[PDB]
Design an enzyme around this catalytic site. Structure first.
Site, PDB file in Angstrom:
ATOM      1  N   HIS A  35       0.825  -1.214   0.000  1.00 24.86           N
ATOM      2  CA  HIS A  35       0.000   0.000   0.000  1.00 24.86           C
ATOM      3  C   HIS A  35       0.856   1.259   0.000  1.00 24.86           C
ATOM      4  O   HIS A  35       0.421   2.296  -0.503  1.00 24.86           O
ATOM      5  CB  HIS A  35      -1.117   0.029   1.098  1.00 24.86           C
ATOM      6  CG  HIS A  35      -0.635   0.366   2.476  1.00 24.86           C
ATOM      7  ND1 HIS A  35      -0.213  -0.593   3.373  1.00 24.86           N
ATOM      8  CD2 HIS A  35      -0.515   1.554   3.112  1.00 24.86           C
ATOM      9  CE1 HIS A  35       0.131  -0.007   4.505  1.00 24.86           C
ATOM     10  NE2 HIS A  35      -0.039   1.292   4.368  1.00 24.86           N
ATOM     11  N   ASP A  84      -0.614  -7.494   1.420  1.00 20.91           N
ATOM     12  CA  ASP A  84      -0.044  -6.158   1.533  1.00 20.91           C
ATOM     13  C   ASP A  84       1.466  -6.278   1.708  1.00 20.91           C
ATOM     14  O   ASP A  84       1.974  -6.076   2.817  1.00 20.91           O
ATOM     15  CB  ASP A  84      -0.758  -5.360   2.676  1.00 20.91           C
ATOM     16  CG  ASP A  84      -0.392  -3.885   2.686  1.00 20.91           C
ATOM     17  OD1 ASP A  84       0.213  -3.437   1.704  1.00 20.91           O
ATOM     18  OD2 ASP A  84      -0.656  -3.171   3.687  1.00 20.91           O
ATOM     19  N   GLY A 184       3.707   3.063  15.219  1.00 21.80           N
ATOM     20  CA  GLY A 184       4.204   2.280  14.094  1.00 21.80           C
ATOM     21  C   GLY A 184       4.066   3.055  12.803  1.00 21.80           C
ATOM     22  O   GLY A 184       3.263   3.993  12.707  1.00 21.80           O
ATOM     23  N   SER A 186       3.350   2.568   8.556  1.00 20.15           N
ATOM     24  CA  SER A 186       2.997   1.681   7.431  1.00 20.15           C
ATOM     25  C   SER A 186       4.272   1.020   6.914  1.00 20.15           C
ATOM     26  O   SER A 186       5.269   1.701   6.707  1.00 20.15           O
ATOM     27  CB  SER A 186       2.393   2.493   6.298  1.00 20.15           C
ATOM     28  OG  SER A 186       1.006   2.425   6.355  1.00 20.15           O
TER      29      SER A 186
END
Length: 241
Positions: A35, A84, A184, A186
């Site tokens: 993503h 992902d 966190g 991505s």
């Protein structure tokens, strides 16, 4: 366990003013979330920094590399975020070298796949997370949280992530406990006990999605690295075979 040399595999990925993290899995390869790359940026506009303490901050052991190319899982869904993951092939220099391994820059080991995770497995997630825009001098430091693996049954509860949890995803965190959604990034690393592996800890998650920074924490949802293990091997192999 160490602290400035604490997560020597974590990579900082930049394009425009967007940001993602990833994980160095070998000197020329970083693993992140698909993503992060779904709008297809030109490889030339990506920047990877290994060994970085603060985002956007240069530092003596920081290494800045171009990316040569990248591959998103061919089945990634921008709608559900199933599958992902992506690989970054870093640009090798005049010498055939990409990451110069150092006490601040070291690859992380992939899971064996022998080890099937359970609610007793202990993990760690590292990242920078939310930081207020402006005033660079106050950029946050990398931080880390200890999180337990969270079962598929408990994660798919209507009250937690529901029918959004799909094969290839795994969850970690506390049902109400908190504080990972604001720290966190991505594509960042979830590193857990393998034991059935040469190393003690292996990379078992890639930060994929979860509750928004500010809302009450839900467990974070991670790409389950072990589910894609043959995909990761096949697309990194040194020789056609």
């Amino acid at each position: 366990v160490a602290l400035r040399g604490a997560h020597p595999y974590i990579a900082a990925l930049y394009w425009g003013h967007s940001f993602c993290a990833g994980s160095l899995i070998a000197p020329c390869w970083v693993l992140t979330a698909a993503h992060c790359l779904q709008d297809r940026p030109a490889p030339e506009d990506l920047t990877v920094v290994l060994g970085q303490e603060r985002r956007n901050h240069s530092c003596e052991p920081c290494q800045t590399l171009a990316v040569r190319s990248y591959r998103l899982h061919e089945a990634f869904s921008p709608v559900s975020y199933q599958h992902d993951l992506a690989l970054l092939r870093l640009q090798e220099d005049a010498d055939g070298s990409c990451a110069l391994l150092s006490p601040y820059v070291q690859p992380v080991s992939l899971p064996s796949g022998a080890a099937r995770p359970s609610e007793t497995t202990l993990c760690q997630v590292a990242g920078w997370g939310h930081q207020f825009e402006g005033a660079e001098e106050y950029a946050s430091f990398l931080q880390e949280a200890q999180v337990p693996f969270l079962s598929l049954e408990r994660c798919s509860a209507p009250d937690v992530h529901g029918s959004s949890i799909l094969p290839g995803m795994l969850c970690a965190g506390f049902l109400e406990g908190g504080t990972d959604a604001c720290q966190g990034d991505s594509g960042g690393p979830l590193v857990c006990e393998d034991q059935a592996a040469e190393r003690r800890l292996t990379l078992q998650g890639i930060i994929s999605w979860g509750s928004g920074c500010g809302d009450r924490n839900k467990p974070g949802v991670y790409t389950d690295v072990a589910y894609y293990l043959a995909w990761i091997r096949e697309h990194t192999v040194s020789h056609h075979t």
